[PDB]
Amino acid sequence: KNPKSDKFKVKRFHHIEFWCGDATNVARRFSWGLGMRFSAKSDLSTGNMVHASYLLTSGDLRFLFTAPYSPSLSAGEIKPTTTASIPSFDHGSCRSFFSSHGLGVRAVAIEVEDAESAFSISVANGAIPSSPPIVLNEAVTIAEVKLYGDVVLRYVSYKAEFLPGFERVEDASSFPLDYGIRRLDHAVGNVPELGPALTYVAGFTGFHQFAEFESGLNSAVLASNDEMVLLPINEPVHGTKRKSQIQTYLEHNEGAGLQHLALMSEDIFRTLREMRKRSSIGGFDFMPSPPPTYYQNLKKRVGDVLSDDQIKECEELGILVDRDDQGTLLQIFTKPLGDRPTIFIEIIQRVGCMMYQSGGCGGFGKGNFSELFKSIEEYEK
Amino acid sequence: KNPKSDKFKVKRFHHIEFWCGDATNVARRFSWGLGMRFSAKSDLSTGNMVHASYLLTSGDLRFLFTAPYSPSLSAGEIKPTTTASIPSFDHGSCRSFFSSHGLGVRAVAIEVEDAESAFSISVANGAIPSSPPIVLNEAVTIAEVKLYGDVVLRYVSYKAEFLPGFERVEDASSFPLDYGIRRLDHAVGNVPELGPALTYVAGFTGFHQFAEFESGLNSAVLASNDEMVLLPINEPVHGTKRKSQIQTYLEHNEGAGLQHLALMSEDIFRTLREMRKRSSIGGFDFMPSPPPTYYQNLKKRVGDVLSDDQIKECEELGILVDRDDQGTLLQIFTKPLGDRPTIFIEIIQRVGCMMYQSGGCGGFGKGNFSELFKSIEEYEK
Numbered sequence: 001k002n003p004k005s006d007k008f009k010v011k012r013f014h015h016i017e018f019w020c021g022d023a024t025n026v027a028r029r030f031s032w033g034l035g036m037r038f039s040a041k042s043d044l045s046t047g048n049m050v051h052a053s054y055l056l057t058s059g060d061l062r063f064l065f066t067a068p069y070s071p072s073l074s075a076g077e078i079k080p081t082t083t084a085s086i087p088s089f090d091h092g093s094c095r096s097f098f099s100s101h102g103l104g105v106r107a108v109a110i111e112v113e114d115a116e117s118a119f120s121i122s123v124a125n126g127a128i129p130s131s132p133p134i135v136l137n138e139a140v141t142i143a144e145v146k147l148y149g150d151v152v153l154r155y156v157s158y159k160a161e162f163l164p165g166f167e168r169v170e171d172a173s174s175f176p177l178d179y180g181i182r183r184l185d186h187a188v189g190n191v192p193e194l195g196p197a198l199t200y201v202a203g204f205t206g207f208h209q210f211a212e213f214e215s216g217l218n219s220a221v222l223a224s225n226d227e228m229v230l231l232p233i234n235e236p237v238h239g240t241k242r243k244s245q246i247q248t249y250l251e252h253n254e255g256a257g258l259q260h261l262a263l264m265s266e267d268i269f270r271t272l273r274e275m276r277k278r279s280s281i282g283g284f285d286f287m288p289s290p291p292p293t294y295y296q297n298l299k300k301r302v303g304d305v306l307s308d309d310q311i312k313e314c315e316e317l318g319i320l321v322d323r324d325d326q327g328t329l330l331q332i333f334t335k336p337l338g339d340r341p342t343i344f345i346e347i348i349q350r351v352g353c354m355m356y357q358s359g360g361c362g363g364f365g366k367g368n369f370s371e372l373f374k375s376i377e378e379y380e381k
Numbered sequence: 382k383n384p385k386s387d388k389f390k391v392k393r394f395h396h397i398e399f400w401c402g403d404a405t406n407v408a409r410r411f412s413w414g415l416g417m418r419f420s421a422k423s424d425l426s427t428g429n430m431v432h433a434s435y436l437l438t439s440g441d442l443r444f445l446f447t448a449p450y451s452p453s454l455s456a457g458e459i460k461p462t463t464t465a466s467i468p469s470f471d472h473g474s475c476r477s478f479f480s481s482h483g484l485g486v487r488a489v490a491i492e493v494e495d496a497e498s499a500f501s502i503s504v505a506n507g508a509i510p511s512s513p514p515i516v517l518n519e520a521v522t523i524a525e526v527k528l529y530g531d532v533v534l535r536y537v538s539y540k541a542e543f544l545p546g547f548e549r550v551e552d553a554s555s556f557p558l559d560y561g562i563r564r565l566d567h568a569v570g571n572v573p574e575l576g577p578a579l580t581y582v583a584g585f586t587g588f589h590q591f592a593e594f595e596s597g598l599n600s601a602v603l604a605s606n607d608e609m610v611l612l613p614i615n616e617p618v619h620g621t622k623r624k625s626q627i628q629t630y631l632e633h634n635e636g637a638g639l640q641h642l643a644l645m646s647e648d649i650f651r652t653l654r655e656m657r658k659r660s661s662i663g664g665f666d667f668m669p670s671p672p673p674t675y676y677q678n679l680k681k682r683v684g685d686v687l688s689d690d691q692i693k694e695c696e697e698l699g700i701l702v703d704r705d706d707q708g709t710l711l712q713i714f715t716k717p718l719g720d721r722p723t724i725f726i727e728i729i730q731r732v733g734c735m736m737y738q739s740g741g742c743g744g745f746g747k748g749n750f751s752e753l754f755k756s757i758e759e760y761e762k
């Protein structure tokens with residue numbers, strides 16, 4: 001069931017903003033590890049005395065990396081005279097966020113029809129305001145409300161190139177890397193209490209619950225009208241034998257925050273080949289692969305969707321496969337992106353639900369909890 | 382003249398420590414950009430609840446990248462019960478350093494015969510103490526004094542593998558990158574006032590002035606007895622047409638700090654080929670090359686040291702060449718390593734002064750100020 005209860009018109013995920021200590025080094029690492037090209041910048045070279053912001057793109061996926069300069073460079077500015085290109089930026093907020101949480105996602109940005117209306121409707125329906133709507137160069141409006149922890153949901157709307165004040169990056173500095181990643185599929189938060197978080201977010205967005213189908217968590221998924229904006233939220237389950245990974249996250253992150261970003265690839269085999277070649281030369285590492293019994297058991301589960309050779313390629317790359325009543329999901333998790341065991345990335349590709357492909361085709365991998373446990377048991381014996 | 386006036390026995394540069402917001406991303410970027418392998422770690426996986434520290438090596442060059450975890454993970458510890466592997470580390474100091482200066486060098490570490498004696502002699506001769514001598518696992522002693530700004534000179538002495546508590550990195554995570562870099566040649570500080578800085582450092586070390594031979598600076602070089610530890614210091618010169626790059630550094634760094642690290646290569650042509658191939662795929666960018674007239678003028682200057690083809694290879698790679706009365710220097714500068722126009726890297730190789738090669742053979746490139754200016758003028762006409 002989909003009541004289509006969005007309280008304002010939502011289009012698609014627009015960008016993810018990471019708050020960093022040094023945006024240059026994080027952006028360069030991510031560019032090489034994920035195959036994203038440098039697309040836009042706002043920094044000292046573009047007249048921005050407040051923050052350094054670098055935009056990477058792959059297909060429709062946009063990752064923004066921002067860090068503050070010394071406040072002394074902008075000490076004479078006031079908000080009406082700011083050289084910042086992102087008017088919600090604040091030196092103290094950014095330093096406090098990074099000191100508290102380490103490297104991580106500050107903003108989940110969605111494109112909407114009208115960011116001023118989305119902000120007003122959200123706040124009228126219980127959203128905690130974070131940054132009021134600001135019109136940039138009479139062309140783009142940006143507004144922010146609190147999502148969970150210190151993560152904001154950012155609304156962006158365009159009258160008609162990322163944001164005014166950003167400059168496109170010179171071709172010499174923009175190498176055309178591409179490992180096949182094409183868009184953000186879902187963005188997942190970890191919170192101490194699922195119920196209150198769901199009530200808050202669904203309360204102000206009108207997003208509906210997306211149907212699914214002891215592992216240490218309870219989860220639920222909120223979705224926009226066309227189910228292309230997908231926001232799962234996890235809470236810990238205490239008392240289990242193995243300590244909840246959600247609780248570990250909350251301890252190391254100093255509270256709620258974004259847990260994982262799931263990036264859709266148009267060719268997950270190519271993406272994983274390219275990312276794994278780079279794991280030990282500056283890129284990203286991947287979680288340990290399931291034992292061969294898991295891929296043995298794939299034949300009975302997905303043998304009508306993947307050939308034996310396609311199953312063998314999943315095994316060579318450590319890819320997991322799940323399936324619900326509508327489609328099939330190929331997925332894999334990276335190790336944490338930075339020093340703390342907090343945020344990580346998921347690479348996914350979905351098979352089925354062709355109408356365009358409907359959002360969330362194949363679910364989120366819930367079936368891989370039981371399958372992985374059984375697979376470990378079978379491999380031991 | 383070399384009075385050999387060192388007040389304690391100094392061996393060689395040992396390591397450089399960067400203080401970071403996220404050590405993982407900076408270390409991974411530097412590893413790929415410079416061709417340094419991951420050699421040792423001290424982090425949550427090794428029992429360190431205080432800081433994440435990753436060691437990269439290339440030859441004898443050691444770069445350490447350290448960032449703090451949440452203080453909550455170690456809130457029950459006291460110094461006698463610390464899980465930190467570097468006992469001088471402090472969460473507040475590291476966060477304050479990074480907020481003030483951005484990504485940069487916290488420690489210039491030199492190996493000495495006895496770090497406790499070096500500390501005592503230094504402090505008795507005016508050094509400002511920063512961290513007292515601490516013996517680690519009855520095997521290594523570490524002590525720190527203030528050098529300039531918030532940079533420390535770290536003394537390390539070994540009874541007889543980086544430091545106790547560090548674990549060697551698994552072969553799967555240690556890809557054997559190598560672009561030819563072999564050791565740290567010199568480490569250069571920028572200060573507001575050269576005279577007081579020189580008097581302070583030479584006062585407590587006994588390091589002597591190393592002989593050299595409007596550009597916006599005055600400089601001098603301090604050297605150990607065998608002239609293998611080389612510490613140049615720059616001050617700005619005000620009033621010039623073009624604004625002093627030393628003054629720009631001090632403004633963006635919030636005061637004195639380490640300006641550049643000069644890394645010796647055993648094959649500068651190979652190093653630059655490898656680094657330039659990676660500039661736009663996660664590595665380091667280089668300063669704009671001199672015009673072809675500069676390489677035209679190289680024949681009259683160094684035609685007895687470099688063949689025409691070797692001069693052509695210098696031109697293809699943007700390498701500069703200087704020469705004094707004893708040797709020849711090949712050198713090139715990177716663009717700043719992070720967001721701020723502060724720290725950068727120099728790659729160098731020295732030709733001559735064979736006895737082993739004596740330290741500082743060929744100078745530091747002072748002749749390239751006049752040569753570059755004349756070269757720009759000639760290229761214009």
Ligand SMILES: C[C@H]1C[C@@H](O)[C@H]([C@H](O)COc2cccc3ccccc23)[C@@H](O)C1
Pocket residue numbers: 186188219220221232233234262320331332333346364365366368369372
């Ligand atoms: C409903 C929420 C909570 C999560 O259940 C879901 C994860 O993404 C699950 O994904 C996986 C579960 C188990 C094993 C995996 C192994 C590799 C990659 C993903 C795996 C999230 O997105 C939406």
Ligand SMILES: C[C@H]1C[C@@H](O)[C@H]([C@H](O)COc2cccc3ccccc23)[C@@H](O)C1
Pocket residue numbers: 567569600601602613614615643701712713714727745746747749750753
């Ligand atoms: C005495 C101190 C002050 C500096 O004069 C020296 C620099 O390293 C100079 O180096 C260069 C000067 C001019 C042009 C260059 C172009 C490329 C690479 C290096 C170049 C430093 O080490 C020790």
Ligand SMILES: [Co+2]
Pocket residue numbers: 186188260262346364
């Ligand atoms: Co997921």
Ligand SMILES: [Co+2]
Pocket residue numbers: 567569641643727745
């Ligand atoms: Co130099």
